[PDB]
Amino acid sequence: GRRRRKKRRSLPAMIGGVYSDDNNLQLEATTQFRKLLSIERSPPIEEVIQSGVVPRFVQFLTREDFPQLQFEAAWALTNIASGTSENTKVVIDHGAVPIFVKLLGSSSDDVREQAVWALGNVAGDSPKCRDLVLANGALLPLLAQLNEHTKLSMLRNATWTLSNFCRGKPQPSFEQTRPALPALARLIHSNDEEVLTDACWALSYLSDGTNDKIQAVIEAGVCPRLVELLLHPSPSVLIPALRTVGNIVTGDDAQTQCIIDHQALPCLLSLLTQNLKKSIKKEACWTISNITAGNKDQIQAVINAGIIGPLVNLLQTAEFDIKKEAAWAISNATSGGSHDQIKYLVSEGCIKPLCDLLICPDIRIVTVCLEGLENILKVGETDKTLAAGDVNVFSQMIDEAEGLEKIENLQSHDNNEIYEKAVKILEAYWM
Numbered sequence: 001g002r003r004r005r006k007k008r009r010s011l012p013a014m015i016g017g018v019y020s021d022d023n024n025l026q027l028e029a030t031t032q033f034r035k036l037l038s039i040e041r042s043p044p045i046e047e048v049i050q051s052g053v054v055p056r057f058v059q060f061l062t063r064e065d066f067p068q069l070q071f072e073a074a075w076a077l078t079n080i081a082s083g084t085s086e087n088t089k090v091v092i093d094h095g096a097v098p099i100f101v102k103l104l105g106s107s108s109d110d111v112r113e114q115a116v117w118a119l120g121n122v123a124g125d126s127p128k129c130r131d132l133v134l135a136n137g138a139l140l141p142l143l144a145q146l147n148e149h150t151k152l153s154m155l156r157n158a159t160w161t162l163s164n165f166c167r168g169k170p171q172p173s174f175e176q177t178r179p180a181l182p183a184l185a186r187l188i189h190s191n192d193e194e195v196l197t198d199a200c201w202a203l204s205y206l207s208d209g210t211n212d213k214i215q216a217v218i219e220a221g222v223c224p225r226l227v228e229l230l231l232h233p234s235p236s237v238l239i240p241a242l243r244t245v246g247n248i249v250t251g252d253d254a255q256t257q258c259i260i261d262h263q264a265l266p267c268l269l270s271l272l273t274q275n276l277k278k279s280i281k282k283e284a285c286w287t288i289s290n291i292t293a294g295n296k297d298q299i300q301a302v303i304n305a306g307i308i309g310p311l312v313n314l315l316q317t318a319e320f321d322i323k324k325e326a327a328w329a330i331s332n333a334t335s336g337g338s339h340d341q342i343k344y345l346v347s348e349g350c351i352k353p354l355c356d357l358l359i360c361p362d363i364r365i366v367t368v369c370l371e372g373l374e375n376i377l378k379v380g381e382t383d384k385t386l387a388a389g390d391v392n393v394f395s396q397m398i399d400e401a402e403g404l405e406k407i408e409n410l411q412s413h414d415n416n417e418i419y420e421k422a423v424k425i426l427e428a429y430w431m
Contacts, residue, residue, distance in 0.1 A: 030072040230264065335371065
């Protein structure tokens with residue numbers, strides 16, 4: 001039941017200046033180009049390209065004697081590359097990528113930072129551009145010049161760039177991004193909201209895939225801190241943290257337990273009971289659902305945390321996108337849970353809201369709720385049998401919640417799977 005799923009850190013005279021061999025004119029004209037290319041809205045990137053200065057800017061990048069010119073040229077190029085994909089291609093075509101990688105070793109902090117920002121912008125353009133940046137060996141030198149003393153502006157640029165290196169579908173080669181894990185594991189210990197935001201997004205990308213990927217993320221040691229970040233007051237941090245936690249719990253039971261072991265369930269509960277955006281509650285319910293898809297000890301941990309009552313209430317009353325996830329959460333619990341655990345779900349009032357969703361237009365959700373009801377009916381039937389009783393108490397509850405009439409009406413459902421289950425349910429419990 002476990003369910004997998006850029007930028008932000010006189011022309012003729014300028015052209016002549018850039019093409020001059022006078023240092024002061026070169027610098028003055030490149031700065032002028034940078035500023036032109038920096039403007040708030042609709043920058044004239046296409047005009048600058050046609051003048052032929054891109055190859056010149058690229059040449060300026062190699063001027064190790066003249067870091068100020070390297071810096072302005074880098075900025076100008078990145079402003080060009082931050083435009084359309086066609087603009088980015090022009091910069092790539094002129095060999096800027098390997099040169100930016102080399103500049104990650106510049107003795108000038110400002111030039112290194114520009115290079116980091118340039119590469120993030122290129123990588124951000126598309127998965128192919130991302131892969132090109134990685135194939136040119138960007139990551140290790142990017143990481144190498146990060147240390148205990150690194151200034152905040154560089155930490156911010158670097159983390160954003162790293163996130164761009166991890167982002168996108170198809171996903172980048174995991175072996176290509178692995179080196180980033182230890183750094184991101186340290187970066188999530190920052191208190192800076194921008195670093196935390198981009199570091200969490202990056203971990204959210206890395207943890208999105210198969211269980212081997214998730215295992216790599218866990219082994220980086222990030223679970224405890226990620227659970228802390230579930231409590232971050234900024235939604236910009238909370239959202240990617242929660243997505244990463246949610247991704248991790250899509251793995252196997254042992255992987256899921258690494259999240260549970262750090263009191264994630266009480267954090268997740270607080271997400272349901274605070275006045276938070278619906279998309280946040282949705283994702284929290286999704287995360288819970290992948291925990292209730294676990295073993296009976298994991299379902300028990302959800303119960304112990306006090307989640308079932310609030311979750312039933314969401315299932316009854318929340319916006320539909322939340323209801324859907326809450327449905328999977330409750331239904332998964334009825335599927336992997338013990339007889340006694342299922343009885344507890346019923347005591348918390350889950351029958352009525354499962355019944356009410358049998359008329360919803362999403363057939364996957366109908367099916368989930370019908371399966372949950374069937375699991376509940378089985379438990380009721382077992383109780384009846386063990387005492388040699390005359391009635392299935394849960395069947396009566398389903399009748400009283402108007403679920404029986406809804407199940408009878410599902411005999412008219414187009415979908416064959418729903419039809420067959422409804423008939424089977426009726427035949428077993430209301431013959």
